[PDB]
Structures are given as C-alpha cells and as structure tokens.
Structure 1
Amino acid sequence: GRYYRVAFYGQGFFEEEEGKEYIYKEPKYTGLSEISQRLLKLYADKFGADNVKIIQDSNKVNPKDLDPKYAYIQVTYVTPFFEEKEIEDRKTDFEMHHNINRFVFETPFTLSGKKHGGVAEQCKRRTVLTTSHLFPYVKKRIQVISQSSTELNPIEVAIDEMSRKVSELNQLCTTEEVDMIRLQLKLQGSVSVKVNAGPMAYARAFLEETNAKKYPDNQVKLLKEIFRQFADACGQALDVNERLIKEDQLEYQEELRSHYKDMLSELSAIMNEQIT
C-alpha cells in the first residue's frame, strides 16, 4: 500500500484524535490529493467546511502557529523504513511489505531559516516514525508513538544524491533487458541538465580549490571518488544507449555524447585529473 503520516491539531474540534499522529495505510497507487481530499471532506462534515485546513509543512508542528478557529490536519507521504541490517534479512517483497512499524520522510531546511537554498546551503532532515503496532493490521491507521531524526549538511546531501545516482545508472546498465526509454530519461537527466542545477553544481560548490575550505578533507575526498564513479557510470550508460537507439535518435545520442564530454572536461579542470 501507500503510507501517509496524518496528525491532528484542533483544540476546539478534535476529541480522542487531538494531538495524535498516525500512519494511514492506503490502497496501492493512492496519491496525495486523494487521501488529503478524503480527510478534508470527512472532518469538514463534522466541523464545518470553512473550519478545516490541511497543513502541508512536513516539519513538526508547533501549535502556537495555529489559529484556534480552525481544525488542522497535517498530511505527509512516508515510505517503509529499513536499516541495512533489516534490508538483507528480508528476501522476498512479501517481507518488506510485512511486519513494518517504521516509516520515513524527508524535510528540506537551511540553517538561515529559509526552507530552500542552492546546493551550498540546502540541508535535509530524515524523520523516522514508529507505530504502536505492526502492519498489516486490522485497522487502516496506527498511532505513531515515537520519532527519530537525523540531518544532512550540504556536502552530505551532495554525497547522498551523487552516490544514489551512480547506483541507479549502474543498475540500468546491468539490467538483462534494458528499457531504453527509462535509460534515456536518467542518462539525459545526468549529462544534459538544462533546467535544474546539474551535477556539476556539486563539483563547483564542494570540490573547487578556489572556494574557501569548509568541510573535512575526508568528505571532500569521498565526494571526489563518487564523481569519478559518476563519470564512469555516465559513460557506460551512454555506451548502452548507443546499442539500443535506432536511426531516429542518432543526432540525439551524439548531442548527449557532446554534453558528456563537456562535463568531463569541466570535472577534469576542477579535480586537476584527466577524467575519462
């Protein structure tokens, strides 16, 4: 199923549910608008439609921010959380869908107080919620009874996002029957970024020697090694795409290669190494 955190705040409105937080288990493929609208209509029928509001902020609510004229419902998508010790003991998919009581979501923040920033400022919080009972369960929701959180600073965000991209690209290249459209989406989204900042934004912010030093040497060294792996993964993905394409995508492929070569040229200049 699809799991959501739902938390109720409404001193003049809620009774048993006041100040409580639950994980709701929804049918597979349930989207955020579907559960949010159902919850909104359900409690609007109890309290009045002008009197119920959704809290979209995923940070822990401070009730001092809330207007006592309204009942509030905080809704946030979560996914089942497993530590690396759990992810190995659980062979089948029936085992990562069975006996689960921990759920994770991520919140963006920066240390200035702004919620978002560029790659040198953007931090991320990972919050794990633990329910009082295990799913699967007789009820559709289970109360959250504890939370834990960790936070990633900007270079840790870069290390996390770049490491995950390397694994994702390598996975696509080793799949027995590569889905060309899925490969191209991720490949083009790595070597030919035009809308978002591009992976070289991390290299400029954290690896360039003309920036003032800010992070431990060992973390800079780790990010450098991940970028070496990213360069390699992009090249391998480009070679797989070369075999898959038909004539209609020759010009597209050659443009991806040109962008890839330009990216390696810039990375080489930043790292003072001849990269591929």
Structure 2
Amino acid sequence: STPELRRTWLESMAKIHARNGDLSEAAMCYIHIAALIAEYLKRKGYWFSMGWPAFLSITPNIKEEGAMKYNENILVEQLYMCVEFLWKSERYELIADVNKPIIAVFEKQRDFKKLSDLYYDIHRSYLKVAEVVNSEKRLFGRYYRVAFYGQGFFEEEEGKEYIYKEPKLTGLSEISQRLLKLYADKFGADNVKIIQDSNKVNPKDLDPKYAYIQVTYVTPFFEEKEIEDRKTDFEMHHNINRFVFETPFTLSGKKHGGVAEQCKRRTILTTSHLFPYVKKRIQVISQSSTELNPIEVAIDEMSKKVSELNQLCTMEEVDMIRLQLKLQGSVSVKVNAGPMAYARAFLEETNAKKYPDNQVKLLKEIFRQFADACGQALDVNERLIKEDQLEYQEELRSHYKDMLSELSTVMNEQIT
C-alpha cells in the first residue's frame, strides 16, 4: 500500500516469474506497475489520465492498486515490458489494449515510424491469434486446489485453500511431489502427508503431529449463461475465478459403489482474484456445491457420451482411431459395466417405479439419442476402415444390434 514498496515487490515478482517461466504472471506484474504509476501520476497533478482505471480492459485485478499511500516515459516502459511477456505467454489478444495507450503518446509526437512499428505489432498479434486460436496449440495451464493443514507447522497458509495455476500440462504427480518436496524440507519429510480425499478436510480427523497438504485437480467452470463470452481458448483462461471438481460417494457412505447407489458431488471454488494475476496461486474465498442422484449420474454420463460420439462424427476430417476408441467403448464394453447397466438399473419397468417420472423419461430420451449416435459412428467407421478392420467393424455392428435389441426389451419400445 506504499508506492515504492509495492512497485519494488511487483518488479521482483516479475523477475522471479520470468525465471520460473510463469510468463503470464510476469506480464500481469508489469500491468500492475503501469497502473500503479498511472494512479500515482494522477494523484499528484500530472495529467491515460484516469489513473489505474486505464488498464481495466486488461484485467480487473488492477483495482487493488487504488489503495496507495515515476514519469510518463517509464510508464510507457512498463507497458513495453508488459507486451513483451504477453507475447511470450501467448496471450496475444491483450497486446492491442496494451499498445493503444502507447499509440496515443506517439500520435502527439508525430513519430510516424514508431506509429508504424506499434500498429505493426498489433497486426502481428492478431495474425498470431487468427492462425492459432481454438487449435489446442496454446497451453495456458492446469489448475489445482491446494489446502494446507497443520497448526504447529504452517505459517500464513495454515487452514487456507488455494487454486494453483501450473504450467502447460502439469499432472497430478508433478505438483504433488513438488509441493511434498518443498514442505518436507522445511518441516522434515517424516511429518508431511498428502490428503487425497477431495472432500472438505475436517481438522478434528487430523492428527496434529503432522502437516497435511490436500491436492485436487480442478478445471475452469462456466455456466450456460457464460458461454456467451468464453468462445476462445484464450477466453477460457482469461479473467476466471471459478473452478470445478466432482467427488464420488454412495448412498451408504463409501466413495465407490454399483450403479444404483453411485452419487457424486459437484463443487465450484471461487477465488479471491481473477487469473491471470501477479501470483500463480490465489486463495479460494467460497465454495458452492450440489449433489447428483444415481439416476442423475447416469443421465450426466450418458449425455456426455452422445456429445462425444456426435462431435467425432461431425469433424471435418474424422479421426478414425479416436472414433473407434469411443465407439467400441460404448457398444462393446467388456471391463466396466457398460451403458446397459444403466438401462437395467433405471429404465426397467420394475426399477423405474423407484424414480420420478420426469427423470426416467429424460434418461430414455438420451438412450434414444445414444442408439442414434452409435449408429452414426458405425456408418462413419464403415467409410474409413481398410481390409484389416472388416471383422472388427462387423463385430461392433453385432454388439450394437444386440445392445439395440436388449434396450428395446427394457424400454418396451422399438429402437431401430
């Protein structure tokens, strides 16, 4: 909250982030410095002139720079820094908003070569977006809920829940062992344990003689209303604060059960600030959760597989192996229970009397869509196989007919 101390910290955080490769966080450091300088330069009559609001198009987090207790040229140099790391971090869509204030400066100077350079950079940034957007080529990060427990051990983290933004495709083993290594060295490896349970930890159940770290993979969450925005791979990682995970539980009290007792909890974690931020972890301030019935779990997983199958078929160039993976995994299940375990548990006349009519009717309709989705995937595979998968395709077809016939008995209805 005191300008020079905040600005020094932001710069050192930027340098650290750059060494660590958290390039988005470096870029956010420089925009927060630029917003800091602009509010300071405003508060002391200097005459964008709005102060920190000048960079809201980049991120709303800069609102916190307005709790403060340096010339125009160095402000422009923080934005140069900011653009540099926006480039490296592949957040190209933001370079324009960051260069617009700089262009204003050089319009006044009549520096036409600089104006050519700046407009050219923005052109290049949008050219990159056009040739890369929505291609799964950009790896903006994986997210993890991390909670710390251990009153005798943990300092500022004790009893606190964070979302950790990890680089690229960082998997569960990577962040787990890295967090375990770091805190094992400060506390002695023999006192540090990982909580794998994704349920909210109850401290009473924990032995105080240990320090605990709870690690859970989460993904960015959006409701249908939010699908208006978030049409881009970038937009799904830009200014986000809600993350979701599901947790299994049964009707009795176990994690895992058969299909007729299997439930799940969907939990949505809301963070203190939006990612990206000047840090790669942000504290969770609230949780929202709901739970799904066994028949609601069935409905959920059946909807997903119809969408999966339908999307593979509608591709401009069908991926044959990917279609076969999902097709065989639906009509030809042999390790798991197979989708017909759901039809047995929830759609058979005698079982359907145990669930509300509207829920079984929605399940029947998704099953209809499922028969159609398998049938289409079969017809698509027929157009792609060579001689070496003729018998394979014939066996999928015979399973699909056999599944169709059993589904018809269960639903007492002609599934074609």
Q: Cα offset for 1:211?
A: 2.6
Aligned length: 276
Aligned to 1:214: 354
CA distance in 2, matches of 1:222, 1:91: 28
CA distance in 1, matches of 2:145, 2:298: 27
What does the per-residue CA deviation read over 1:154-205, in whole Å, with 9 as the maximum and x for residues that have no partner? 0100111101111111111110100101000000000000000000000000
Q: Does 1:233 align with 2:401?
A: no
Q: Is the 8 A contact 2:346 2:352 kept in 1?
A: no
Instruction: Indicate the structure (1 or 2) with the bigger Cα radius of gyration.
Output: 2
Higher relative contact order (CA 8 A, sep 6+): 1
Q: Cα offset for 1:41?
A: 0.5
CA distance in 1, matches of 2:351, 2:359: 15
CA distance in 2, matches of 1:122, 1:155: 9
Q: Cα offset for 1:92?
A: 1.9
Q: Is the 8 A contact 2:219 2:245 kept in 1?
A: yes
CA distance in 2, matches of 1:34, 1:114: 28
Q: Cα offset for 1:88?
A: 2.3
Task: Considering fraction of residues, name the structure with more strand.
Answer: 1
CA distance in 2, matches of 1:150, 1:218: 19
CA distance in 2, matches of 1:78, 1:249: 38
Q: Secondary structure at the match of 1:210?
A: helix
CA distance in 2, matches of 1:268, 1:73: 50
Q: Is the 8 A contact 2:352 2:360 kept in 1?
A: no
Q: Cα offset for 1:212?
A: 6.4
Q: Cα offset for 1:111?
A: 2.2
Aligned to 1:152: 292
Q: Cα offset for 1:244?
A: 0.5
Aligned to 1:135: 275
Q: Secondary structure at the match of 2:237?
A: coil
1:212–1:26 distance in 2 versus 1, CA, 3 Å: closer
CA distance in 2, matches of 1:86, 1:172: 25
Aligned to 2:164: 24
Unmatched 5+ residue regions in structure 1?
none
Q: Cα offset for 1:11?
A: 1.0
Q: Secondary structure at the match of 1:67?
A: coil
28-37 or 84-93: bigger deviation: 84-93
TM-score by length of 2: 0.66
Unmatched 5+ residue regions in structure 2?
1-140
Q: Cα offset for 1:235?
A: 0.3
What does the per-residue CA deviation read over 1:227-255, in whole Å, with 9 as the maximum and x for residues that have no partner? 00000000000000000111000010000
Task: Say what the alpha-carbon RMSD is for the aligned residues.
Answer: 0.8
Q: Cα offset for 1:274?
A: 1.2
Q: Cα offset for 1:210?
A: 2.8
181-190 or 91-100: bigger deviation: 91-100
CA distance in 2, matches of 1:52, 1:123: 31
Task: Considering fraction of residues, name the structure with more helix.
Answer: 2
CA distance in 2, matches of 1:242, 1:168: 18
Q: Secondary structure at the match of 1:93?
A: coil
CA distance in 2, matches of 1:219, 1:211: 13
TM-score by length of 1: 0.99
What does the per-residue CA deviation read over 1:88-127, in whole Å, with 9 as the maximum and x for residues that have no partner? 2222221111000000000000120111111100001000
Q: Is the 8 A contact 2:145 2:161 kept in 1?
A: yes
